């Protein structure tokens, strides 16, 4: 059919293009076969559907179903209130959630995904980097208040307050308050910081000198063990049974009977 430029079926509505329908109040449909069905809804481009109040669909084959939702780009879906899908193949099924990049899915409250093919299902969590998609998501962030940066990382359900900066790190169930650093690292306990695994271990370099005292929670360098400054003399002396040299040149604490017996 020939292009048409006129008013729609709603009050103060506008259709401009080919086979466009604007059924809402003050709604706008511009392009090829766009649908704006609610109040103050905008559908611009090729086959866009705006099915929420004050929702915007811009680009090619975008869906905006939630209130104050935004779908921008190529085949993006926004479903909840104040959700944002930007890029290619992004789905946002969480309130105040953000999906930005290629094939990302977010379904948590106040969660963010940036990059390629991650899924975040936890609350107040975040993903930065790359995963894998072949029909189902193989790497997900299922923990609350946890953040991961890198490639092919996993956090299970029930493991909360965890941070990953690296590659190929899988955290099992029952682990909380842990940090993992480096490529191919393992975490197997709570309240720990790991810098390697059981097959490869990493050295820590360029470390300052810590205090050598009773209540001192500071790391110790190699030179401090090499020298021995600041140690408790009495404890080391009564741990390794030692005859003090000043006590040896004057015959102190000597059993006279046995010494007379031998000599």
């Amino acid at each position: 059919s020939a292009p048409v430029f006129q008013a729609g079926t709603g009050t103060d509505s506008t259709v401009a293009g080919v086979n466009n329908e604007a059924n809402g109040e003050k709604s706008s449909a511009f392009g090829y076969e766009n649908k704006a069905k609610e109040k103050l809804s905008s559908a611009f481009g090729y086959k866009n559907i705006a099915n929420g109040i004050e929702g915007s669909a811009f680009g090619i084959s975008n869906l905006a179903k939630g209130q104050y939702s935004s779908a921008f780009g190529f085949r993006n879906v926004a479903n909840k209130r104040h959700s944002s899908a930007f890029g290619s193949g992004n789905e946002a099924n969480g309130e105040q959630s953000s999906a930005f990049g290629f094939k990302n899915t977010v379904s948590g409250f106040n969660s963010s995904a940036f990059g390629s093919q991650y899924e975040v299902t936890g609350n107040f969590s975040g993903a930065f980097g790359m995963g894998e998609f072949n029909g189902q998501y193989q790497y997900k962030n299922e923990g609350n208040n946890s953040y991961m940066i890198g490639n092919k990382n996993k956090i299970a359900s029930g493991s909360n307050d965890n941070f990953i900066l690296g590659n190929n790190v899988h955290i099992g169930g029952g682990i909380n308050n842990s940090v993992a650093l480096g490529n191919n690292s393992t975490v197997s306990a709570s309240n720990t910081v790991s810098v390697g695994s059981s097959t490869l271990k990493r050295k820590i370099v360029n470390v300052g000198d810590g205090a050598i005292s009773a209540n001192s929670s500071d790391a110790v360098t190699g030179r401090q063990l090499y020298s021995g400054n600041g140690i408790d003399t009495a404890a080391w002396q009564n741990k390794l049974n030692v005859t003090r040299k000043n006590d040896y040149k004057d015959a102190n604490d000597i059993d006279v009977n046995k010494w007379k017996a031998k000599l």
Partner: protein, 108 residues
């Protein structure tokens, strides 16, 4: 139309079965194999990704299944609880999906 066929339809208790695909769409992105008649996450066997030549097992992986680059499946050492339906999920380059279903039975 995308179709799945099984060889042989009637399978022995210790032989293998091959599931082949006819009318495969061109310009794909990936495909996966499921157990049942629906695309369920908990009943996925194996999946393949073309862009990186990657094969990854799924939650339902007994260790007897092999995928092929022409989207075909091989199951060996058949036991009596492997009889029924299998479902194939295909992802095209434009992110649109397609599905197909196949069936076979096992006899002693």
């Amino acid at each position: 139309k995308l179709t799945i066929e099984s060889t042989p339809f009637n399978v022995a208790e210790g032989k293998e079965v091959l599931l082949l695909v006819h009318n495969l769409p061109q310009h794909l992105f990936g495909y996966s194999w499921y157990k049942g008649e629906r695309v369920d996450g908990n009943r996925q066997i194996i999946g393949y990704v073309i862009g990186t030549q990657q094969a990854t097992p799924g939650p339902a992986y007994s260790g007897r299944e092999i995928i092929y680059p022409n989207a075909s499946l091989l199951i060996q050492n058949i036991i009596q609880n492997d009889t029924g339906f299998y479902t194939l999920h295909v992802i095209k380059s434009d992110l649109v999906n397609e599905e197909a279903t196949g069936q076979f039975r096992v006899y002693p």
